Enzyme design. Structure first.
Site, PDB file in Angstrom:
ATOM      1  N   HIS A  12       0.701  -1.295   0.000  1.00 60.31           N
ATOM      2  CA  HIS A  12       0.000   0.000   0.000  1.00 60.31           C
ATOM      3  C   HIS A  12       0.727   1.344   0.000  1.00 60.31           C
ATOM      4  O   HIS A  12       0.102   2.382  -0.196  1.00 60.31           O
ATOM      5  CB  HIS A  12      -0.981   0.007   1.182  1.00 60.31           C
ATOM      6  CG  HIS A  12      -1.870  -1.195   1.230  1.00 60.31           C
ATOM      7  ND1 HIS A  12      -2.833  -1.482   0.283  1.00 60.31           N
ATOM      8  CD2 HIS A  12      -1.874  -2.242   2.094  1.00 60.31           C
ATOM      9  CE1 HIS A  12      -3.378  -2.662   0.579  1.00 60.31           C
ATOM     10  NE2 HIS A  12      -2.829  -3.165   1.668  1.00 60.31           N
ATOM     11  N   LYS A  36      -4.245 -10.020  -7.594  1.00 58.86           N
ATOM     12  CA  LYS A  36      -4.985  -9.495  -6.448  1.00 58.86           C
ATOM     13  C   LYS A  36      -6.097  -8.682  -7.141  1.00 58.86           C
ATOM     14  O   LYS A  36      -5.817  -7.808  -7.948  1.00 58.86           O
ATOM     15  CB  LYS A  36      -4.105  -8.588  -5.595  1.00 58.86           C
ATOM     16  CG  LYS A  36      -4.845  -8.020  -4.411  1.00 58.86           C
ATOM     17  CD  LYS A  36      -3.913  -7.374  -3.421  1.00 58.86           C
ATOM     18  CE  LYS A  36      -4.754  -6.851  -2.263  1.00 58.86           C
ATOM     19  NZ  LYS A  36      -3.837  -6.368  -1.245  1.00 58.86           N
ATOM     20  N   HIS A 114      -2.989  -3.529   7.890  1.00 57.98           N
ATOM     21  CA  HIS A 114      -3.991  -3.942   6.924  1.00 57.98           C
ATOM     22  C   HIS A 114      -4.714  -2.721   6.393  1.00 57.98           C
ATOM     23  O   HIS A 114      -5.041  -1.824   7.151  1.00 57.98           O
ATOM     24  CB  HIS A 114      -4.994  -4.892   7.592  1.00 57.98           C
ATOM     25  CG  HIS A 114      -6.200  -5.198   6.747  1.00 57.98           C
ATOM     26  ND1 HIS A 114      -6.204  -6.097   5.700  1.00 57.98           N
ATOM     27  CD2 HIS A 114      -7.472  -4.734   6.833  1.00 57.98           C
ATOM     28  CE1 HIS A 114      -7.455  -6.152   5.188  1.00 57.98           C
ATOM     29  NE2 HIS A 114      -8.268  -5.344   5.840  1.00 57.98           N
ATOM     30  N   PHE A 115      -4.932  -2.662   5.088  1.00 60.07           N
ATOM     31  CA  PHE A 115      -5.670  -1.546   4.507  1.00 60.07           C
ATOM     32  C   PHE A 115      -7.142  -1.985   4.502  1.00 60.07           C
ATOM     33  O   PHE A 115      -7.504  -2.898   3.772  1.00 60.07           O
ATOM     34  CB  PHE A 115      -5.207  -1.255   3.071  1.00 60.07           C
ATOM     35  CG  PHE A 115      -5.806   0.013   2.504  1.00 60.07           C
ATOM     36  CD1 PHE A 115      -7.051  -0.008   1.887  1.00 60.07           C
ATOM     37  CD2 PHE A 115      -5.154   1.224   2.655  1.00 60.07           C
ATOM     38  CE1 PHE A 115      -7.648   1.177   1.434  1.00 60.07           C
ATOM     39  CE2 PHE A 115      -5.747   2.422   2.202  1.00 60.07           C
ATOM     40  CZ  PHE A 115      -6.998   2.386   1.593  1.00 60.07           C
ATOM     41  N   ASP A 116      -7.977  -1.345   5.304  1.00 59.02           N
ATOM     42  CA  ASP A 116      -9.360  -1.785   5.406  1.00 59.02           C
ATOM     43  C   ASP A 116     -10.328  -1.193   4.404  1.00 59.02           C
ATOM     44  O   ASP A 116     -11.173  -1.907   3.880  1.00 59.02           O
ATOM     45  CB  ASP A 116      -9.896  -1.527   6.818  1.00 59.02           C
ATOM     46  CG  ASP A 116     -10.979  -2.536   7.233  1.00 59.02           C
ATOM     47  OD1 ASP A 116     -10.806  -3.729   6.985  1.00 59.02           O
ATOM     48  OD2 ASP A 116     -12.004  -2.140   7.824  1.00 59.02           O
TER      49      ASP A 116
HETATM   50  O1  LIG Z   1     -10.500   0.054  -0.585  1.00 59.94           O
HETATM   51  C1  LIG Z   1      -9.973  -1.028  -0.368  1.00 59.94           C
HETATM   52  C2  LIG Z   1     -10.599  -2.154   0.237  1.00 59.94           C
HETATM   53  C3  LIG Z   1      -9.943  -3.305   0.329  1.00 59.94           C
HETATM   54  N1  LIG Z   1      -8.666  -3.456  -0.127  1.00 59.94           N
HETATM   55  C4  LIG Z   1      -7.986  -4.759  -0.054  1.00 59.94           C
HETATM   56  O2  LIG Z   1      -8.824  -5.737  -0.592  1.00 59.94           O
HETATM   57  C5  LIG Z   1      -8.442  -7.009  -0.037  1.00 59.94           C
HETATM   58  C6  LIG Z   1      -9.687  -7.795   0.297  1.00 59.94           C
HETATM   59  O3  LIG Z   1     -10.449  -7.083   1.301  1.00 59.94           O
HETATM   60  C7  LIG Z   1      -7.578  -6.749   1.189  1.00 59.94           C
HETATM   61  O4  LIG Z   1      -6.240  -7.175   0.896  1.00 59.94           O
HETATM   62  P1  LIG Z   1      -5.662  -8.568   1.448  1.00 59.94           P
HETATM   63  O5  LIG Z   1      -6.148  -9.679   0.582  1.00 59.94           O
HETATM   64  O6  LIG Z   1      -4.193  -8.332   1.588  1.00 59.94           O
HETATM   65  O7  LIG Z   1      -6.279  -8.718   2.906  1.00 59.94           O
HETATM   66  C8  LIG Z   1      -7.511  -5.227   1.319  1.00 59.94           C
HETATM   67  O8  LIG Z   1      -6.266  -4.681   1.641  1.00 59.94           O
HETATM   68  C9  LIG Z   1      -7.967  -2.414  -0.697  1.00 59.94           C
HETATM   69  O9  LIG Z   1      -6.808  -2.500  -1.076  1.00 59.94           O
HETATM   70  N2  LIG Z   1      -8.678  -1.245  -0.791  1.00 59.94           N
HETATM   71  N1  LIG Z   2      -8.769  -5.818  11.181  1.00 59.69           N
HETATM   72  C1  LIG Z   2      -7.603  -6.401  10.915  1.00 59.69           C
HETATM   73  N2  LIG Z   2      -6.591  -6.242  11.794  1.00 59.69           N
HETATM   74  C2  LIG Z   2      -5.415  -6.834  11.536  1.00 59.69           C
HETATM   75  N3  LIG Z   2      -5.066  -7.597  10.508  1.00 59.69           N
HETATM   76  C3  LIG Z   2      -6.103  -7.742   9.657  1.00 59.69           C
HETATM   77  C4  LIG Z   2      -7.358  -7.183   9.779  1.00 59.69           C
HETATM   78  N4  LIG Z   2      -8.157  -7.543   8.695  1.00 59.69           N
HETATM   79  C5  LIG Z   2      -7.379  -8.314   7.975  1.00 59.69           C
HETATM   80  N5  LIG Z   2      -6.127  -8.498   8.513  1.00 59.69           N
HETATM   81  C6  LIG Z   2      -5.017  -9.328   8.068  1.00 59.69           C
HETATM   82  O1  LIG Z   2      -3.975  -8.555   7.515  1.00 59.69           O
HETATM   83  C7  LIG Z   2      -2.716  -9.057   8.020  1.00 59.69           C
HETATM   84  C8  LIG Z   2      -1.641  -8.956   6.989  1.00 59.69           C
HETATM   85  O2  LIG Z   2      -0.367  -9.094   7.619  1.00 59.69           O
HETATM   86  C9  LIG Z   2      -2.984 -10.478   8.472  1.00 59.69           C
HETATM   87  O3  LIG Z   2      -2.085 -10.807   9.527  1.00 59.69           O
HETATM   88  C10 LIG Z   2      -4.421 -10.413   8.969  1.00 59.69           C
HETATM   89  O4  LIG Z   2      -4.473  -9.991  10.313  1.00 59.69           O
END
Ligand SMILES: O=c1ccn([C@@H]2O[C@H](CO)[C@@H](OP(=O)(O)O)[C@H]2O)c(=O)[nH]1
Ligand SMILES: Nc1ncnc2c1ncn2[C@H]1O[C@H](CO)[C@@H](O)[C@H]1O
Length: 119
Positions: A12, A36, A114-116
């Site tokens: 990110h 992704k 984590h990017f939520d």
């Molecule tokens: O606006 C958003 C919302 C979600 N995610 C991403 O979408 C994936 C599925 O929720 C997440 O990445 P991960 O697979 O590493 O957990 C999160 O970082 C983004 O990058 N941007």
């Molecule tokens: N709310 C959250 N807090 C922490 N990690 C999260 C959350 N949602 C998804 N993840 C994930 O993202 C991390 C990426 O290192 C994972 O360890 C897993 O915890």
């Protein structure tokens, strides 16, 4: 093994063209094994992003409460897989916007893990 904080920076952060996502998703290794589907890059300093961890607390999409929302909008770019995308030939639509970001934080010191969401 990469830590959660290191993974957050690689996927990110781009502290700082239509092909931007295509280049970045590849260089940051988010196209190995599978494409992704959606990812967001943040163009603010790492210091400004880490500072969100001490900003507004909000609930995480998964229900956890270790999430925080930026006090200000930030310059970000959303990368989304296009319909024609098909691993290993991934393809992304690049969209720049200015929005607030919501990140989960963890560790000591508390840093983004984590990017939520963007809001
Ligand atoms: O606006 C958003 C919302 C979600 N995610 C991403 O979408 C994936 C599925 O929720 C997440 O990445 P991960 O697979 O590493 O957990 C999160 O970082 C983004 O990058 N941007
Ligand atoms: N709310 C959250 N807090 C922490 N990690 C999260 C959350 N949602 C998804 N993840 C994930 O993202 C991390 C990426 O290192 C994972 O360890 C897993 O915890």
């Amino acid at each position: 093994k990469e830590s959660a904080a290191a993974k957050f920076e690689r996927q990110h952060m781009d502290s700082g063209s239509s092909n931007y996502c295509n280049l970045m998703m590849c260089c940051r290794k988010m196209t190995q094994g599978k494409c992704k589907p959606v990812n967001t890059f943040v163009h603010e300093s790492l210091a400004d992003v880490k500072a969100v961890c001490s900003q507004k607390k909000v609930t995480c999409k998964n229900g956890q409460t270790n999430c925080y929302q930026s006090k200000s909008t930030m310059r970000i770019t959303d990368c989304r897989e296009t319909g024609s995308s098909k691993y290993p030939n991934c393809a992304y639509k690049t969209t720049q916007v200015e929005k607030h970001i919501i990140v989960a934080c963890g560790g000591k010191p508390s840093v983004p893990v984590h990017f939520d969401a963007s809001v």
